[PDB]
């Protein structure tokens, strides 16, 4: 009888936690074809989302158990289409690129003065854009764990050559 459990955290595998699990003599662990430990338990001091994957042990081989890490939205950046240089009177679309697990439930958009703007989706269409709308904008993601902020990405509105 060979298998693996997640002793040490109740559940709720979040990136700040010190995670663990033990195999139930000569111990061996394995992830992605490489052995990561010869002890009975394979433990982490601070879990990172890339530590997530399918692990296995053998003392005869265990069956694959998938480690899943939940984390607040990270690496948020405001993309702009067609770009950050849009002519006045046309469209400027702001996309809040995100990476989270579970994915972002709702977004929140702000301007340079940290005033919330009435939009909740991942993409925000400004139309028609005005030269007064030139300035810094940033979004915010939210999920089960926490929040995530994006840096100030500015959009420039230029007049038309007439």
């Amino acid at each position, epitope marked *: 009888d060979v298998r693996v459990r997640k002793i040490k955290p109740l559940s709720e595998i979040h990136s700040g936690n010190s995670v663990s699990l033990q195999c139930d003599v000569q111990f061996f662990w394995e992830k992605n074809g490489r052995l990561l430990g010869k002890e009975s338990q394979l433990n982490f001091d601070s879990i990172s989302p890339e530590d997530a994957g399918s692990y296995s042990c053998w003392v005869t081989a265990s069956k694959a158990w998938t480690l899943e890490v939940l984390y607040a939205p990270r690496r948020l950046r405001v993309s702009m289409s067609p770009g950050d240089q849009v002519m006045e009177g046309k469209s400027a679309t702001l996309t809040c690129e995100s990476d989270a697990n579970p994915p972002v439930s*709702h977004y929140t958009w702000f*301007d340079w*003065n940290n005033q*919330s*703007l*009435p939009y*909740h989706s991942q993409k925000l269409r400004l*139309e028609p854009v005005k030269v007064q*709308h030139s*300035g810094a904008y940033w979004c915010q993601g939210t999920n089960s764990v926490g929040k995530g902020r994006s840096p100030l990405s500015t959009l420039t509105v230029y007049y038309s050559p007439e």
Partner: antibody
Amino acid sequence: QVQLQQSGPGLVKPSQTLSLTCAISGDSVSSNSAAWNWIRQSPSRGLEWLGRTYYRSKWYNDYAVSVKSRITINPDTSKNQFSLQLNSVTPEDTAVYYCAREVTGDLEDAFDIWGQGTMVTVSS
Amino acid sequence: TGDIQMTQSPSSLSASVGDRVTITCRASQTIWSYLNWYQQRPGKAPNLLIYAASSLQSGVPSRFSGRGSGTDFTLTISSLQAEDFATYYCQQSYSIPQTFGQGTKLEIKR
């Protein structure tokens, strides 16, 4: 108590431009926690959102693509109103036009205060 | 994917006073809990009944209730009253343009 009062001509000749006004009581059009919309209703098509104007640090506008070419929603800070202008009207534009306050919270986003409505007929 | 389209069911229903009635609203794309329910009595503007899928607006009787998130929602009148004769609409506020359902006409048998 927040109330919205509508006014404007209910008979517009074809190819001419509709113009309505929604007066605000108990609130300001420059409210950073709200947005001021226009919604039309007809038995032909039902309720259709037309556009809105709101102020945060600048004045912004969101428009339905149906009327993007003809719609214009400008606020009035001195009289605490916001307008609706629709150029080159057709008999298809005959409908009841509502103004409404949109409470724009982070999680609550609804039209809670509505105007009484203004029936507009496009006819010669 | 485009504009979010709301479809209500049924388009019309008949019920007697005191009956339990439910109105379903489905969104073509997920809107989480950015859904609103309105009541339009004859000759009147739409009235906000429920916002954020499940929260009752001030003044609305307790017989109205909302439920759901994502793409499928439900408006419930536990004990129908004669005053509830109206058309009911669902509306999403998650994405611009905001869109309404086609409405549900509620007629009272007596």
